[PDB]
Amino acid sequence: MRILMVGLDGAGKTTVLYKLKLGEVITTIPTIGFNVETVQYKNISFTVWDVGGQDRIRSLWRHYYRNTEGVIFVVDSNDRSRIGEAREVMQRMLNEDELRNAAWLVFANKQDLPEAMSAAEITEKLGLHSIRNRPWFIQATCATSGEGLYEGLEWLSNS
Amino acid sequence: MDSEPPSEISLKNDLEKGDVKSKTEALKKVIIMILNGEKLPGLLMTIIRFVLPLQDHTIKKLLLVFWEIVPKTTPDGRLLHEMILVCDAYR
């Protein structure tokens, strides 16, 4: 299974990936580029493309769209200023023809932080209810603990 | 591929295949058809996707090659930006 994981910078995309691959919480640098890794979960081998979220790189995601079976969209639940921006990025991503049938999994992340928005709140802000054309799911996660990560891999594998 | 102007559908297939040699050969086949002067933009997203960050020189060199002879014309996988897919991860 081919997976594209994106989201704004600092959402926690690489932390998520290497928690999944190494069971370890690594010390990230901003990703100017991608990381690509293969992860085994329950007889599925997920090839995850973690593509950096800062602006220059954001402009490049479209090259990773093609062949994508599922999309992990990571959100920093503690950052309320950038939630609209996330909504804007994700909405036009939903309009992409190469992403047309891909399974849509939102991770509301850093759920560990006291003022993190809830997954329900995030669902309203991102406009997730309005997707009728394909599968979507939202999952509260904490990438450092590992909470919600495998519930994500589970949902994804049931595409 | 000496000069074969309709072969762009096969090149897309050959461009990502999970085999590095095939990808290199494909990108090479694109170069030779452009230099003669033949069809090339269909491929762009495929071309750009494997190679981008890597320090692995041969594909990078190949992509680097294709950016001095047609970068401006091709726009499927590049479009128009300041830090295009010609140079963003080529920093």
Tokens coding A106: 């939102």
Which amino acid would we find at residue A127? G
Q: Which residues contact A124 (CB under 8 A, 6 or more apart)?
A: none
Which of A101, A68, A155 is CA-nearest to residue B16? Answer: A68
Query: Which uninterrupted H or E stretch holds A36?
Result: strand A34-41
Q: Which residues contact A20 (CB under 8 A, 6 or more apart)?
A: A37, A39, A48, A149, A153
Strands A136-140 and A44-51: unpaired
Which of A125, A149, A147 is CA-nearest to residue A72? Answer: A149
Which amino acid would we find at residue A148? G
Q: How far are the Cα atoms of A10, A35, A109, A153, B59 from residue A16, in angstroms, in the given order?
A: 11, 11, 9, 12, 29
Tokens coding B20: 């590095």
Q: Which residues pair with A3 in a beta bridge?
A: A48, A70
* Residue A54 bears catalytic tag: yes
Residue A39: left if φ>0, alpha if ψ -120 to 50, beta else—which one?
beta
Helix (H, G, I), strand (E, B) or coil at A5: strand
Which of A14, A33, A34 is CA-nearest to residue A25? Answer: A14
What residues 37-66 of chain B have any CB closer than 8 A to a CB of chain A? Answer: 45-46, 48-49, 52-53
Residue B38: left if φ>0, alpha if ψ -120 to 50, beta else—which one?
beta
How far is residue A145's CA from residue A137's CA, in Å, rounded to a whole number? 20
Distance of CA B37 to the CA centre of its chain: 15
How far is residue A79's CA from residue B24's CA, in Å, rounded to a whole number? 42
CA distance B31 to chain A (A): 20
Q: How far are the Cα atoms of A62, A111, B72, B88 from residue B9, in angstroms, in the given order?
A: 20, 46, 21, 27
- Across the A:B interface, residue pairs with CB atoms under 8 Å apart total 37
Q: Which residues contact A71 (CB under 8 A, 6 or more apart)?
A: A3, A4, A5, A6, A93, A99, A102, A103, A104, A105
How far is residue A16's CA from residue A143's CA, in Å, rounded to a whole number? 5
Tokens coding A124: 């309203």
Strands A44-51 and A70-76: unpaired
Cβ of A92 under 8 Å from any chain B Cβ? no
How far is residue B46's CA from residue B56's CA, in Å, rounded to a whole number? 18
Q: Name which of B45, B83, B91 is nearest A63 (Cβ-Cβ).
A: B45
Starting at the earlier edge strand, list the strands of the sheet with A2-7: A34-41, A44-51, A2-7, A70-76, A103-109, A136-140
What residues 17-76 of chain A have any CB closer than 8 A to a CB of chain B? Answer: 32-34, 56-57, 59-60, 62-67
Q: Please spell the DSSP secondary structure of B6-74, one letter per residue.
A: S-HHHHHHHHSSS-HHHHHHHHHHHHHHHHH----GGGHHHHHHHHSS---HHHHHHHHHHTTTSTTT-
How far is residue B83's CA from residue B24's CA, in Å, rounded to a whole number? 24
How far is residue A19's CA from residue A151's CA, in Å, rounded to a whole number? 14
The answer to whether A149 touches A20, Cβ cutoff 8 Å, is yes
